[PDB]
């Protein structure tokens, strides 16, 4: 027959009777010392109220079963954290933690990129103020006219509205015909072309091989400045401190060895217009 995971839970909680308004005083005092007899009856009696609260958040990000189960997490926290010294009521205190738990769960389990609780609270203000303005009188929604109603700068409103991720799906058929997907047409920026990969490996080996066709002392100062022969980046004063042992003499051989590779590069068929343009 027809079976669903929604009505199977509602029929199980609908068999427990309602708690009398004069019987919860004996169960609340016993829960402080610790006993698994009054806590089971107190939570089971409040299961009929979490459904009416979860039904108010219709067409939201979370489903109906996720909203009912999230509200039940606050019921245990509300019972264990309470004080019966007031004696005014007890059902009005459980609905404060159940409603607070839905808001903290509907903003952390809705979007893909999780937003912190300090920036997501003020984001609902810009979205709520934008709804009333668009329906004033044949009005069109825009980010320019909303900056004056909230006294917000022009650069601040563009960042708050742009903070919404609103991620799309790549497994969607673009167009009327369902024959092509969005993921099959995307490219990558990190990986390169097989010809470009060999082009970078050839130039990297030609640069290191050209350094051997020079003086034995001019190749050591250039390998320590830029860090090409297995070295790191450094400055001119650091190389001329201990290895260089000079102030301006290291800077003199650096400008001569810089132009020495310029003439050997132009004669090799690789001019400035072909690489640097």
């Amino acid at each position: 027959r027809a079976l669903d995971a929604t009505q199977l839970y509602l029929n199980e909680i609908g068999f427990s009777p309602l708690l009398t308004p004069e019987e919860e005083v004996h169960f609340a005092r016993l829960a402080q010392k610790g006993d698994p007899a009054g806590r089971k009856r107190m939570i089971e009696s409040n299961l009929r109220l979490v459904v009416k609260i979860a039904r108010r958040y219709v067409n939201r990000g979370l489903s109906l079963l996720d909203l009912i189960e999230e509200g039940n997490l606050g019921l245990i926290r509300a019972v264990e954290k309470f004080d019966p010294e007031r004696g005014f009521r007890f059902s009005t205190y459980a609905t404060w933690w159940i409603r607070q738990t839905i808001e903290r769960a509907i903003m952390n389990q809705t979007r893909t990129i999780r937003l912190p609780i300090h920036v997501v609270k003020e984001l609902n203000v810009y979205l709520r103020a934008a709804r009333e303005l668009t329906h004033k009188l044949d009005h069109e929604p825009s980010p320019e006219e909303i900056a004056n109603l909230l006294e917000k700068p022009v650069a601040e409103v563009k960042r708050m509205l742009g903070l919404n991720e609103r991620v799309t799906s790549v497994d969607v058929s673009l167009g009327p015909d369902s024959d092509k997907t969005l993921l099959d047409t995307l490219t990558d920026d990190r990986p390169t072309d097989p010809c470009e990969l060999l082009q970078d490996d050839d130039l990297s080996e030609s640069i290191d091989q050209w350094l051997t066709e020079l003086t034995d002392k001019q190749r050591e100062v250039v390998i320590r400045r830029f860090g090409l022969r297995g070295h790191e980046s450094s400055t001119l004063e650091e190389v001329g401190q201990e290895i260089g042992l000079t102030r301006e003499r290291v800077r003199q051989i650096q400008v001569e060895a810089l132009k020495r590779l310029r003439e050997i590069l132009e004669k090799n068929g690789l001019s400035s217009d072909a690489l640097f343009q």
Binding site: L183, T185, T187, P191
Partner: protein, 96 residues
């Protein structure tokens, strides 16, 4: 087309860089090569010309060096298939 950009998940040729992609080698052309005796021509168009990160880059280096024999490796369409079946709670490996 000789080379160009490739897709993200399946390393296959595609357009988008002011250039078209490649020619789709369907199953009808595979049966034509299987009807012939071209076994190396069929394996080349299925492994070293598409879905091979270590196959396309190493074959391009061979054409420039002068010699060219083969670079089979393993197609990326089958490497992704193994990682998807394993994610369904079904073990699949190579006995060799």
């Amino acid at each position: 087309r000789s080379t160009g950009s490739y897709s993200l998940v399946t390393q296959q040729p595609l357009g988008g860089k002011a250039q078209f992609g490649g020619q789709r080698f369907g199953e009808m052309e595979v049966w034509a090569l299987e009807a012939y005796g071209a076994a190396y021509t069929l394996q080349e168009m299925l492994t070293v010309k598409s879905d091979d990160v270590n196959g396309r880059t190493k074959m391009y280096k061979n054409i420039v060096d002068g010699d060219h024999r083969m670079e089979a490796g393993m197609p990326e369409s089958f490497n992704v298939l193994i990682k998807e079946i394993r994610s369904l709670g079904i073990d699949i490996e190579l006995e060799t």
